[PDB]
Amino acid sequence: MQASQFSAQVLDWYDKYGRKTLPWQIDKTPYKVWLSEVMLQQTQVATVIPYFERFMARFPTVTDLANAPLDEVLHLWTGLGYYARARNLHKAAQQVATLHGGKFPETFEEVAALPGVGRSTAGAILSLSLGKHFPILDGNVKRVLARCYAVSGWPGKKEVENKLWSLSEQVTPAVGVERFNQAMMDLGAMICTRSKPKCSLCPLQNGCIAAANNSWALYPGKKP
Numbered sequence: 428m429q430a431s432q433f434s435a436q437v438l439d440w441y442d443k444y445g446r447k448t449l450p451w452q453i454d455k456t457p458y459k460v461w462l463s464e465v466m467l468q469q470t471q472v473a474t475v476i477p478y479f480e481r482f483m484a485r486f487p488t489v490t491d492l493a494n495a496p497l498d499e500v501l502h503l504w505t506g507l508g509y510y511a512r513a514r515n516l517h518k519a520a521q522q523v524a525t526l527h528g529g530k531f532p533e534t535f536e537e538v539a540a541l542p543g544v545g546r547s548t549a550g551a552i553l554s555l556s557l558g559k560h561f562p563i564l565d566g567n568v569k570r571v572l573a574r575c576y577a578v579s580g581w582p583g584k585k586e587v588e589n590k591l592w593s594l595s596e597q598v599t600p601a602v603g604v605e606r607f608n609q610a611m612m613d614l615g616a617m618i619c620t621r622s623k624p625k626c627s628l629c630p631l632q633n634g635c636i637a638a639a640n641n642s643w644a645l646y647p648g649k650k651p
């Protein structure tokens with residue numbers, strides 16, 4: 428499907444059905460988007476929301492998080508699993524307090540230099556909170572693009588992951604990037620699911636190659 432048609436259909440879909448009232452979209456900031464991206468990495472949204480709210484009440488700024496004892500951070504994380512995320516979260520807050528005056532960095536290289544933050548998390552923080560023109564590629568997004576454009580192969584191989592980053596760059600627009608990147612997370616979470624995707628509710632169904640051939644189970648490829 429042509430890229431300009433892809434982005435316009437995703438944006439029109441988000442206008443009419445999209446998630447717009449999550450706590451981190453009210454009065455968005457880079458701090459709020461970073462905290463939400465780290466909690467969502469290995470946890471589903473319904474579980475994350477109460478934890479996000481308790482972390483913003485206790486730590487209203489990144490300096491408050493940096494100055495707190497690591498044990499108080501681990502105690503509030505209890506129940507989220509995957510505690511390396513919490514240890515990296517605290518070190519990253521200390522780096523922002525120490526190197527950047529307590530203000531969350533706004534350039535890609537400085538954001539991705541934080542522990543716990545990779546290439547997709549960095550572009551999510553800067554596109555969603557400030558409107559910068561960066562694409563994302565988490566597991567939800569990988570599945571939508573690999574099925575729409577029939578990208579087989581395991582994304583654990585570099586050549587395959589690079590093909591997926593190039594497709595995400597191509598379909599991600601500059602006008603409406605904040606809406607588009609949230610919409611691709613929503614589609615991958617709620618519509619183009621791992622098992623039996625809901626293609627009749629998908630705004631890409633008229634041009635998706637997997638839907639034309641009922642071949643969604645081939646994309647992305649699995650570990651060989």
Ligand code: SF4
Nearest residue numbers: 619626629632635638
């Ligand atoms: S039409 Fe179906 S397989 Fe294609 S992107 Fe949408 S939900 Fe996924």
